[PDB]
Amino acid sequence: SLWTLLTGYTKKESTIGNSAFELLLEVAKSGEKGINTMDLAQVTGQDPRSVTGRIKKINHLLTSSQLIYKGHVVKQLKLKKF
DNA sequence: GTCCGATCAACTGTAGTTAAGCTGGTAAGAGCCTGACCGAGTAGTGTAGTGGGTGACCATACGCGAAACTCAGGTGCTGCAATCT
């Protein structure tokens, strides 16, 4: 049901991998504030290459835009509903 | 271009103006090398940006193997009937 409510599909058939789904859960927790890709990377505990390669699987669910943070160039992520 | 021949001075006869250096004590040209002052020269440097190639991580593909699932093989008794008696 959590899978279905967030992705629109059940765990039994959804195309999103477990790691990418946990990324989505972090964006779900942050809601209206959303998460920048580096704080997401730090909180999930994985590197920016891995985060970027995974985020492709969910870019249709997320509104995004560029921003500059701690001298690095990053994007903000928000679920469409927020 | 050349022709005539007048004519400043070329090259030719003797009558009269120019240094060099001596006695010195001396300031005058022409000068030398260290030093200082700015302009220019030798040239590697200081940020800043374009491109490229390495590295990691992924997924996509086949191909071999592993277990799954479907459908039909195979076991063994005995309910019922028929051969030998």
Amino acid occupying residue A68: I
Point out which residues pair with A68 in neighbouring strands: A73
State both tokens at A25.
């859960």
Place of tokens 């994007």: A75
Does residue A54 lie within 7 Å of nucleic acid chain B, judged by its CB? yes
Cα A22–chain centre separation: 8
Resolution in A: 3.8
Q: From which experimental method does this structure derive?
A: cryo-EM
> What is the number of alpha carbons within 13 Å of residue A19 lying toward its C-beta?
12
Does residue A17 lie within 7 Å of nucleic acid chain B, judged by its CB? yes
Amino acid occupying residue A9: Y
- Name the strand (E) or helix (H) holding A30: helix A18-30
DSSP symbol at A10: -
Dihedral angle computed from the Cα positions of residues A49, A54, A56 and A59, in that order, rounded to the nearest 10 degrees: -110
State which residues between 24 and 53 of chain A bring their CB within 7 Å of strand B: 47, 49-50, 53
